[PDB]
Amino acid sequence: WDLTVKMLAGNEFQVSLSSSMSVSELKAQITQKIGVHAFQQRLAVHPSGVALQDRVPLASQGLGPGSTVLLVVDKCDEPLSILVRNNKGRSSTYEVRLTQTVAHLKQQVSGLEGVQDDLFWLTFEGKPLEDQLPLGEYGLKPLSTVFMNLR
C-alpha cells in the first residue's frame, strides 16, 4: 500500500504500509520520514479535509492504495498540570510535557513520594505506563489523574 502525505506547512512524500494498514502504522512511517512523534501528528483525508478516526480501519474512511492524506504537526509542548494519586489516595500535582517519558514522571513521583522507582508503576484510566514511551502516547491532558501502584 503506497500513500501520498501532504504536510500543510511543508513537504509531500510517499509512505508504504506493508503490515496492519492502520492509522498507527501510517503515523509510525511518518515518524521514520520527518522524525515527529506519532501523538503530535494530525491527519485528514485529501481533499475533503475530514479528520482520520484513530481506531477505524483506513479502508472504511475512503483511503487505500494511491490515496492522499493531509498532515499537520501539533506545535504545542507547553507544560501541563496532572495529578498522581499515591497508595493512600493522596494526589500531588506534577507539571509534565507530553514529549517527556513515563521515566521522567516516575523520577518526579519517586522524589516527592520517597519511594524507589522499581517499587511502583503508574496507570492512566487503568492502562499501565511504559518507562520508555512519551506521556503523549497515552493521551494525558491537563487534569488527567494517574495512579501510583506499589509492588
Residue numbers in the entry: 3 to 153
List sentences quoted exactly from the publication behind this structure:
We additionally determined structures of the free hISG15 and K48-Ub2 to 2.15 and 1.25 Å resolution, respectively. The bound and free hISG15 conformations are similar with a root-mean-square deviation (rmsd) for Cα atoms of 1.34 Å based on the alignment of the C-terminal (proximal) UBL. In ISG15, the two UBL domains are connected through a relatively short, likely more rigid peptide linker (DKCDEP in hISG15), and the C-terminal (proximal) UBL binds to S1 site while the N-terminal (distal) UBL binds to S2 site on PLproCoV-2.
The Papain-like protease (PLpro) is a domain of a multi-functional, non-structural protein 3 of coronaviruses. PLpro cleaves viral polyproteins and posttranslational conjugates with poly-ubiquitin and protective ISG15, composed of two ubiquitin-like (UBL) domains. PolyUb and ISG15 have common other structural features: ISG15 comprises two Ub-like (UBL) domains and mimics a head-to-tail linked di-ubiquitin (Ub2). While K48-linked Ub2 (K48-Ub2) and ISG15 are similar both in sequence and fold, the topologies of how the two domains are linked are distinct.
